Design a protein around this ligand. Structure first.
Ligand SMILES: Nc1ncnc2c1ncn2[C@@H]1O[C@H](COP(=O)(O)OP(=O)(O)OP(=O)(O)O)[C@@H](O)[C@H]1O
Ligand SMILES: Nc1ncnc2c1ncn2[C@@H]1O[C@H](COP(=O)(O)OP(=O)(O)OP(=O)(O)O)[C@@H](O)[C@H]1O
Ligand SMILES: Nc1ncnc2c1ncn2[C@@H]1O[C@H](COP(=O)(O)OP(=O)(O)OP(=O)(O)O)[C@@H](O)[C@H]1O
Ligand SMILES: Nc1ncnc2c1ncn2[C@@H]1O[C@H](COP(=O)(O)OP(=O)(O)OP(=O)(O)O)[C@@H](O)[C@H]1O
Lengths: 235, 316, 253, 249, 209, 386, 239
């Protein structure tokens, strides 16, 4: 019976559900897992890079990207939708800086990206299907470090610690167990890397992960091979 | 530009190109085959024993006596007694693959206690019969709440004024889930069989598996009852991540596996699979370890089995 | 049909007559040959000629003789036939209109010919399974080959596939000579010109041309035949029903 | 069923509507072209020769696209007319912009881009016409190209499209000399292959039209051979055939 | 157009045996029964004597042999193939002449149209003016007729009247006369019958013209 | 009663016509003469039971025992559908009669007088393997993996049945070889029958279905019964898609009987104890999921078309016996990216040899191979992809 | 019925028709690309043509600019359209900003084009895969690969088309810094990797070479013959 109520994004099922939106939410899973953690010292993003074969130089699997000098976006889903939404986020941050001569709040930028993702089939904007990608915006603003999760349905919500991607269900419980409100950035990094090792196919070693941090201070930083090895030494 | 072979051409083809021992080789090979056939012919049948009992156990006296007078009888299931007409019962018989007849039987104790609807031995010529022939999630939580509680203390239902009913449909690991719920009435996936099941049941939660012989079975069953059907109101489907991990652990306990196995990771890698599929994955991991010639199966072997059994750059 | 005749003669005669050649070559003997082509090209006629000029036991299955109503009888009949061929080896099994017994299989449902499909599977097994056939050659014939099950077309079950294209006007002249040899012709007659007047005509059409020319001769209580009668017979036999709206015809420039 | 639209990919990755158009080109009247160092030529059969039709147009399949270029169409009549007019427009647009005739490769590229756009965009059926272009330009002298319904073009020494294209191309491969063919030999070969491919009694001079493009005095000339010249060529070919038959006898 | 009647003619002018069968008779519910019936018919005709098998209505079985992607149509195709194979196969027949009639010769299989199996392909067109005159004479015979009748008008009036409907014209003119209490039919009686047989359909949505 | 195996003579290693092979064959023939002479010589060298026979019916019949009763009475099927409440003589073994056994009955009185344990349906007896195909694993080019899995499924569980026990893993008792039309599916079964010590049993799905009443299910019963009586055994069912297609509600009686036989087969696939089953199939989707359920068909071996290396190996295997010419080069034929089965390669080699013979030359050549490849294969538009 | 629509999702979350476009790509002649220290090379299989067919009208290697080349695998018409638009945008970017296009920029633009064509419902995806090899304005042997789904990655050496998997595995095994130390070992590696699919080695091979601050050069058939002779000599010597 679920074959006539999901031919279009603008068709309601008897349960009053947007099955196409639900289907895109399901599509979210295919991507590699990402974990973001908020702490009073900042926010940390760690993503399981999923190199399908070596000889692929790592600077093309962009699961963590930079939004302005104060936010980082972790992606899970279609690379095309990832690129489109990342471009929108960057353009919106720069436009807000140009207009109001300030730095957009993480909540505001996530809201703008969600506003772009809202337009499903509205004949007034031209995408026609949900953006099969889930994003984690971790940044620093006047309200202290913050982290937000946005899903294809345009819904965004604050999250002091969240995980998305293929290892979403298995990592959410680990985050719940290991999370106490007060940590340090190093503690969050260690916990996130431990969870990644728990829910990663490969042995966690130097490459195959990416780690980024935004702190009330130095701008968004991508940990290089040296720091990655240093942390992996005593995860 | 195509020619036809000549007799001299083919003779030259046969002789010219050949090692000097070709003819002898063919002769010896034909000899081999013919002699093998001759040996097969001359085998000599090994006398097929008739099943005769060891000597000194035969009597031949009871044998002669039974041969002289044992009156072999044919087997047939009675269908009706035509109400027995009080006297002159006039039973009806359905000699299988042969015919249906009517009979008075006689020589037995009581026209009614003889038989009603079950096997009987009809005499050869006069069809008078002589002898009465003898013959895990809410998917389990709900079933628990509807069976086990009205197993040790069903009287609570009557205490509260509710009638505790029977009859639950296990539509959907159905078999072993039902067995665990029992932890017994085994059933096979006709009217005589269900009648027999009625007799066994009524001298004591009947686990029907796969649920006009069959129509008569349904009629008698419905009349008797007013039970666990196993079609394939509680529903059964695949388990979630934690259920798959639990099944993996349950089935990998009995293996020479390595110390630590990421069963959570394997459950994540194995979606939409069944319990039988999980069993197959574990067994394939075992054969993979054996192929590798290593006594201890590892996570690598388990992952290889997952890939082989259950089963790209646009999603990272 | 010189090339086809000699190819089929290879496949059947050469293995049955002189297996030593294949033994020396070190190649397994050919087993089956499938004759396919448009109607009236000479498939069944060549089968008859082989049966007449072959000294091997010639068995013939024609049409859907193996499609028996009783359950599990076609397979039994096929097995018995192959047993009989083995008994009277060397054997040549002609099999006309295989697409009757055996075509592209279907998803077995309420609307599937499961019995015929399984009989065809039995035929497959007999042609190539365990205990491969010793001296049982098979000459299957069909009109449309594309629908035949790929299992049948598998080389080993059909070691050769002979096409029977319509004559190239030279085969047409030869067929006219063959079928008019017993015809009281008249001087000043050009069977060659008749052949050219017949384009793309099958051998059956040529035989019909001869028959209709004879019929026209009979019409005038005659024993003659002439270019007029032959031309009229060609026109009558090749009565092509074309399309005359000219718009459906000129849609394609 | 992966063939209800021109913009649908079958699970194997096949454009079934495009393939249907390519196959359906097989119904078009036979056309063929041969390249020679002296010049280039096309021959084409008239599918319908009913005696109640006029010869108002001195060409039915061969059109002149510009001063230095001609093309033969094979396919649906409406699409053929549309593409012919559009080719004329493209060539004259290039002439207006650059003040020099468009190279044949460039014209083929433009029209094939348009064909591909039709195969790719929305609810438009692919242009179901194949084309054979002949032209001259200062960059590659004489050229002959062949364009398919799917917007794919290739440069050929000699080729054939339409009815009996397989037989015609087989004969062209067998008989065509790679680099020592003159215009007369090309015409003889064209008549021979047309005779062996039409399979309609004798090759009547009225059931065929031939065009020849050659450079003369620095100016290209495309001549549509008259009935007299076609009659002469067919008569010469049948004389050669009779000589061969007599010698074989 | 009077083809079944021509078959009835043979059978009242043939010294040979006759076997009339219906194209739909060969079909059967059980697998293989259709082919068995075809083989039985042909073998019986071959063995008895010079015989004529009149398979009327052949289009019930012989239609173009498409893939058929099912069971029943494949059984029909097997009936057709058995018919082809018996008419011209390995075991050639002799003196088993066959006649078959159909209302639509286009759909028939191209293999059961091959000189050697169907080498005549006779057409039975709708009557021309001359055939209309002959039919009218033959029918109006054995019939009392008025002196004022002009069959020429009816014959000349261009229509699509077939032999069966010409017979119907004469028959209903006869019944109209009987009801009118008269054994000699008048021109009014025919005119009525001719109108009631032509049955010219009207009300055609006129924009089509 | 143990396995039955298949008698097979040793294999002469040299495939060339040489004195090694000649002497090996001569020794084989010497030993065959010895066997024949020993037989001849031995068979030349060589009351109470009489009354037992006299009491036993002269033309005694064979029936089936059912629901043994008492110690002297039992129900027996006459083998025509009917059954009788017969008696048992003291002659029979007793403590040996079980339901389904093929007992012997006095013709007239119909009294049990024998047991006839070796009663085998002629169909089962004939489908049992006696000879052994001379296709060892060496003849199979490529399919190295498939050979590995088949050995692990039907060979290791017999030669080294300790690895499975060490880790408490039950062996797979069912292997379905599914693939396109001709890739070695039957070759692997041939090689297994050749090289195995187990009782092989050839069958084809189109053979188990008989017409009279329930003889289909009865024959399946007999087949698996003998496969159990002998052990280890390997039952090779070729083209199982004859019976096993998607089970559907029957509209007739024959279809109901077919589904009944298939169900009887599935039932007999729950009689573990060591009787391996090897299904073969050209199209596996049509098979019912119940059969392919992962509890009765444990392994599914796909037989894909051969790659370049596999095609090369096949070509050397099938040309080893051919007097190849030095000019030949066996790469162009292979790597031409076109479908080519192992059967297709054998056909190519045979047609090439025939072409050389037609040309009157006993040595094949490159042009002969090219012509063979052109004329053997029978069956995307140009330019559309580059 | 979860198919035959570019803008419809399936339970697994797939875009089946763009996946089908990738499958269509998989049916094209093999094209390998490699990057060296100062040389970037593209090899492509030819598949040969009938003698009656001219060759200059068949192209699998096309220069998108002075410092960027493009190898192709997929549908030829889509190839022509994509290459034309890529050249147009290269020149347009040169106009907009007075700096030659970077390989990353141009490959991103091509990926965006494919993404735009696969977003909507009335458009068919460009069923092609492309390899962009070039030298950035600072000097670097960059190589990217773009798929029909609008996704582009950066590689060091990759093969697309029919023999993609086998040739990629061979490059995986036999790609090393010493194997690309100089500007001839890279070419030798390219012919070695293509020989597992092509037959003649010289008659079914086309090579294009880009050297820093030097225009593209297509290797002559005689040069290819000499190179394949060198590889054959090396193989026999190592034997
Ligand atoms: N919740 C569970 N707890 C324990 N074992 C389970 C569970 N779910 C599945 N299994 C495993 O599944 C198998 C039992 O399943 P069972 O044989 O009943 O099949 P099923 O899934 O009901 O299939 P079907 O009815 O379609 O044949 C055993 O391997 C058992 O270990
Ligand atoms: N090459 C030929 N030489 C002579 N006569 C021929 C030839 N081909 C066909 N014929 C004539 O055609 C008649 C029918 O031929 P045949 O039945 O073998 O044709 P077919 O190709 O098998 O056709 P069908 O499709 O009807 O089975 C032959 O009896 C013979 O009269
Ligand atoms: N030529 C004719 N001469 C005289 N009466 C004719 C003629 N044709 C048809 N009829 C009349 O029409 C009746 C039906 O003719 P007949 O059954 O032979 O036609 P048909 O074309 O075979 O019809 P059908 O297609 O319905 O089988 C004949 O009994 C006769 O009454
Ligand atoms: N791998 C192989 N090695 C050697 N010969 C092979 C191979 N594969 C196929 N053959 C040849 O093909 C035949 C073996 O194929 P086989 O009968 O096993 O195929 P199959 O899968 O059962 O076919 P089908 O589906 O058509 O019944 C023999 O001729 C053998 O020579």
């Amino acid at each position: 019976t679920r074959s006539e109520y999901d031919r279009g994004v603008n068709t309601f099922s008897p349960e009053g559900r947007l099955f196409q939106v639900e289907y895109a939410i399901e599509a979210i899973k295919l991507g590699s897992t990402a974990i973001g953690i908020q702490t009073s010292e900042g926010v940390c993003l760690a993503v399981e890079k999923r190199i399908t074969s070596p000889l692929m130089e790592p600077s093309s699997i962009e699961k963590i990207v930079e939004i302005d000098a104060h936010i980082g976006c972790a992606m899970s889903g279609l690379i095309a939708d990832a690129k489109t939404l990342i471009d929108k986020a960057r353009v919106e941050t720069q436009n807000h800086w140009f207009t109001y001569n300030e730095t957009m709040t993480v909540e505001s930028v996530t809201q703008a990206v969600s506003n772009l993702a809202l337009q499903f089939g509205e004949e007034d904007a031209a995408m026609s299907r949900p953006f099969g990608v889930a994003l984690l915006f971790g940044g620093v603003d006047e309200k202290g470090p913050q982290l937000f999760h946005m899903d294809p349905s345009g819904t965004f919500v604050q999250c002091d610690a969240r995980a998305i991607g293929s290892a979403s269900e298995g990592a959410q419980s680990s985050l719940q167990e290991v999370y106490h409100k007060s940590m340090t950035l190093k503690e969050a990094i260690k916990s996130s890397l431990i969870i990644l090792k728990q829910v990663m196919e490969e042995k966690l070693n130097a490459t195959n992960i990416e780690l980024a941090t935004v702190q009330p201070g130095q701008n968004f930083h991508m940990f290089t091979k040296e720091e990655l090895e240093e942390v992996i030494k005593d995860i | 530009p195509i020619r036809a072979l000549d007799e001299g051409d083919i003779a030259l083809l046969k002789t010219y190109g050949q090692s000097t021992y070709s003819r002898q080789i063919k002769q010896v090979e034909d000899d081999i085959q013919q002699l093998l056939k001759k040996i097969n012919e001359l085998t000599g049948i090994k006398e097929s024993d008739t099943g005769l009992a060891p000597p000194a156990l035969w009597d031949l006296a009871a044998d002669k006596q039974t041969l002289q007078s044992e009156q072999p009888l044919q087997v047939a299931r009675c269908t009706k007694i035509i109400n027995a007409d009080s006297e002159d019962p006039k039973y009806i018989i359905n000699v299988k693959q042969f015919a249906k007849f009517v009979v008075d039987l006689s020589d037995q104790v009581a026209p009614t206690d003889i038989e009603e609807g079950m096997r009987v031995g009809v005499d050869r010529n006069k069809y008078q019969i002589h002898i009465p022939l003898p013959p895990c999630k809410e998917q389990i939580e709900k079933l628990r709440e509807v069976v086990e509680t009205p197993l040790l203390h069903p009287e609570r239902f009557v205490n509260l004024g509710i009638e505790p009913p029977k009859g639950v449909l296990l539509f959907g690991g159905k078999t072993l889930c039902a067995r665990a719920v029992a932890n017994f009435i085994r059933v096979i996936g006709g009217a005589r069989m269900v009648r027999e099941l009625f007799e066994m049941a009524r001298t004591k939660l009947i686990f029907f598996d796969e649920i006009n012989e069959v129509q008569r079975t349904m009629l008698e069953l419905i009349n008797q009852l007013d039970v666990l059907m196993a079609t394939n109101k509680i529903e059964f489907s695949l388990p979630d991540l934690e259920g798959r991990t639990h099944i993996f652990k349950i089935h990998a306990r009995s293996m020479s596996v390595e110390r630590d196995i990421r069963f959570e990771l394997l459950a994540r890698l194995c979606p939409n699979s069944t319990g039988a599929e999980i069993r197959s994955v574990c067994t394939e991991a075992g054969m993979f370890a054996i192929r590798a010639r290593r006594k201890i199966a590892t996570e690598k072997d388990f992952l290889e089995a997952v890939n082989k059994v259950i089963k790209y750059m646009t999603y990272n | 049909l010189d090339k086809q005749i000699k190819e089929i003669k290879e496949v059947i005669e050469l293995p049955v007559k002189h297996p030593e050649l294949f033994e020396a070559l070190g190649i397994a003997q050919p087993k089956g040959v499938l004759l396919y082509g448009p109607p009236g090209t000479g498939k069944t006629l060549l089968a008859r000629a082989v049966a007449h000029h072959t000294d091997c036991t010639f068995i013939r299955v024609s049409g859907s003789e193996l499609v028996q109503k009783f359950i599990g009888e076609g397979a039994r009949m096929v097995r018995e036939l192959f047993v009989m061929a083995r008994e009277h080896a060397p054997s040549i099994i002609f099999m006309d209109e295989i697409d009757s017994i055996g075509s592209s299989r279907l998803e077995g449902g309420s609307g599937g010919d499961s019995e015929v499909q399984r009989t065809m599977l039995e035929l497959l097994n007999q042609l190539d399974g365990f205990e491969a056939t010793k001296n049982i050659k098979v000459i299957m014939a069909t009109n449309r080959i594309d629908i035949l099950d790929s299992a049948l077309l598998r080389p080993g079950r059909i070691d050769r596939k002979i096409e029977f294209p319509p004559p190239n006007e030279e085969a047409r002249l030869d067929i006219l000579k063959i079928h008019s040899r017993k015809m009281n012709l008249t001087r000043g007659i050009n069977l060659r010109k008749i052949a050219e007047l017949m384009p793309g005509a099958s051998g059956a059409e040529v035989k019909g041309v001869c028959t209709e020319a004879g019929m026209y001769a009979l019409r005038e209580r005659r024993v003659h035949v002439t270019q007029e009668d032959f031309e009229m017979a060609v026109a009558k036999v090749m009565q092509k029903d074309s399309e005359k709206n000219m718009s459906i015809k000129k849609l394609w420039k | 069923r992966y063939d209800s639209r021109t913009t649908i990919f079958s699970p194997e990755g096949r454009l079934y509507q495009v393939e249907y158009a390519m196959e359906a080109i097989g119904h078009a009247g036979t056309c063929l072209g041969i390249l020679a160092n002296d010049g280039v030529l096309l021959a084409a059969e008239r599918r319908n020769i009913h005696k109640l039709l006029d010869e108002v147009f001195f060409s039915e399949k061969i059109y002149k696209l510009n001063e230095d270029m001609a093309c033969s169409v094979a396919g649906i009549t409406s699409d053929a007319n549309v593409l012919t007019n559009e080719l004329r427009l493209i060539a004259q647009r290039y002439l207006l912009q650059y003040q020099e005739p468009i190279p044949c490769e460039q014209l083929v590229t433009a029209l094939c881009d348009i064909k591909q756009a039709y195969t790719q965009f929305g609810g438009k059926r692919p242009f179901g016409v194949s084309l054979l272009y002949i032209g001259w330009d200062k960059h590659y002298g004489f050229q002959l190209y062949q364009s398919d319904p799917s917007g794919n073009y290739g440069g050929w020494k000699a080729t054939c499209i339409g009815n009996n294209s397989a037989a015609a191309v087989s004969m062209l491969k067998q008989d065509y000399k790679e680099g020592e063919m003159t215009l007369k030999s090309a015409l003889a070969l064209a008549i021979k292959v047309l005779n062996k491919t039409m399979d309609v009694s004798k090759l009547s001079a009225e059931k065929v039209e031939i065009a020849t493009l050659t450079r003369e005095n620095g100016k290209t000339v495309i001549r549509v051979l008259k009935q007299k010249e076609v009659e002469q060529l067919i008569k010469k070919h049948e004389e050669e055939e009779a000589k061969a038959e007599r010698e074989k006898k | 157009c009077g083809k079944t009647m021509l078959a009835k003619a043979v059978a009242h002018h043939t010294t040979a045996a006759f076997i009339r069968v219906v194209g739909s008779e060969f079909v059967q519910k059980y697998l293989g029964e259709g082919p068995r019936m075809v083989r039985d018919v042909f073998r019986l005709a071959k063995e008895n004597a010079p015989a004529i098998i009149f398979i009327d209505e052949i289009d019930a079985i012989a239609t173009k042999r498409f893939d058929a992607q099912t069971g029943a149509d494949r059984e029909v195709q097997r009936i057709l193939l058995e018919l082809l194979n018996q008419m011209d196969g390995f075991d050639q027949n002799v003196n088993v002449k066959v006649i078959m009639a159909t209302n639509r010769a286009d759909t028939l299989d191209p293999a059961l149209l091959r000189p050697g199996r169907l080498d005549r392909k006779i057409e039975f067109p709708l009557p021309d003016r001359r055939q209309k005159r002959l039919i009218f004479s033959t029918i109006t015979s054995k019939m009392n007729l008025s002196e004022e009748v002009d069959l020429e008008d009816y014959v000349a009036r261009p229509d699509k009247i077939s032999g069966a409907d010409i017979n119907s014209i004469c028959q209903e003119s006869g019944m109209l006369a009987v009801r009118e209490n008269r054994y000699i039919v008048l021109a009014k009686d025919f005119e009525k019958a001719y109108k009631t047989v032509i049955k010219k359909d009207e009300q055609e949505h006129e924009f089509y013209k | 009663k143990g396995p039955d195996a298949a008698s097979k003579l040793p294999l002469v290693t040299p495939h060339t016509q040489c004195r090694l092979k000649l002497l090996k064959l001569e020794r084989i023939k010497d030993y065959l003469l010895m066997e024949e002479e020993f037989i001849r010589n031995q068979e030349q060298m060589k009351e109470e039971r009489s009354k037992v026979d006299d009491l036993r019916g002269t033309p005694m019949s064979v029936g089936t025992l059912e629901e043994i009763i008492d110690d002297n009475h039992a129900i027996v099927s006459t083998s025509v559908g009917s059954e009788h409440y017969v008696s048992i003589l003291s002659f029979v073994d007793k403590d040996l009669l079980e339901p389904g056994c093929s007992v012997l009955l006095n013709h007239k009185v119909h009294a049990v007088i024998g047991v006839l344990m070796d009663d085998t349906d002629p169909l089962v007896t004939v489908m049992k393997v006696e000879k052994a195909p001379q296709e060892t694993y060496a003849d199979i080019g490529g399919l190295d993996n498939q050979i590995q899995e088949i050995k692990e499924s039907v060979e290791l569980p017999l030669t080294h049945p300790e690895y499975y026990e060490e880790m408490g893993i039950k062996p797979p008792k069912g292997v379905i070889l599914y693939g396109p039309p001709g890739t070695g599916k039957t070759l692997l079964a041939k090689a297994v029958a050749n090289q195995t010590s187990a009782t092989f049993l050839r069958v084809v799905g189109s053979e188990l279905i008989q017409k009279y009443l329930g003889d289909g299910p009865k024959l399946v019963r007999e087949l698996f019964r003998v496969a159990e009586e002998h052990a280890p055994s390997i039952v090779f069912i070729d083209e199982i898609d004859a019976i096993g297609t998607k089970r559907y509600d029957s509209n007739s009686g024959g279809e109901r009987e077919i589904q009944r036989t298939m169900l009887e087969l599935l039932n007999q696939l729950d009689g573990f104890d060591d009787v391996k089953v090897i299904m073969a199939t050209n199209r596996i989707e049509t098979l019912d999921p119940a059969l392919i359920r992962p509890g009765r068909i444990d392994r599914k071996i796909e037989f894909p078309l051969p790659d370049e290396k596999t095609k090369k190996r096949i070509f050397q295997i099938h040309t080893s016996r051919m007097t190849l010419a030095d000019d030949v080069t066996l790469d162009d034929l292979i790597m031409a990216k076109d479908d080519l089965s192992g059967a297709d390669i054998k056909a190519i080699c045979t047609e090439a040899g025939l072409m050389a013979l037609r040309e009157r030359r006993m040595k094949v050549t490159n042009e002969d191979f090219k012509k063979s490849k052109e004329n053997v294969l029978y069956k995307t538009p140009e330019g559309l992809y580059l | 019925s979860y198919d035959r629509a570019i803008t419809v999702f399936s339970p697994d979350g797939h875009l089946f028709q763009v996946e089908y476009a990738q499958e269509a790509v998989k049916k094209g002649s093999t094209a390998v690309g490699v990057r060296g220290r100062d040389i970037v090379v593209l090899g492509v299989e030819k598949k040969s043509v009938a003698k009656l067919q001219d060759e200059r009208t068949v192209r699998k290697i096309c220069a998108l600019d002075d410092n960027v080349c493009m190898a192709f695998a997929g549908l030829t018409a889509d190839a022509r359209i994509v290459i034309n638009r890529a050249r147009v945008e290269c020149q347009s970017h040169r106009l907009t900003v007075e700096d030659p296009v970077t390989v990353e920029y141009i490959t991103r633009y091509i990926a965006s084009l494919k993404q735009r064509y696969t977003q909507s419902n009335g458009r068919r995806p460009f069923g092609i895969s492309a390899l962009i090899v070039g030298f950035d304005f600072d000097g670097t042997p960059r190589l990217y690969q773009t798929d029909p789904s609008g996704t582009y990655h950066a590689w060091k050496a990759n093969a697309i088309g029919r023999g993609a998997k086998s040739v990629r595995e061979f490059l995986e095994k036999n790609y090393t810094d010493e194997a690309i130390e100089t500007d001839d070992l890279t070419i030798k590696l390219v012919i070695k990797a293509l020989l597992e699919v092509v037959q003649s080695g010289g008659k079914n091979i086309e090579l294009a070479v880009m050297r820093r601050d030097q225009s593209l050069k297509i290797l002559n058939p005689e040069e290819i013959e000499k190179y394949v002779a060198e590889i054959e000599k090396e193989k026999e010597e190592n034997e």
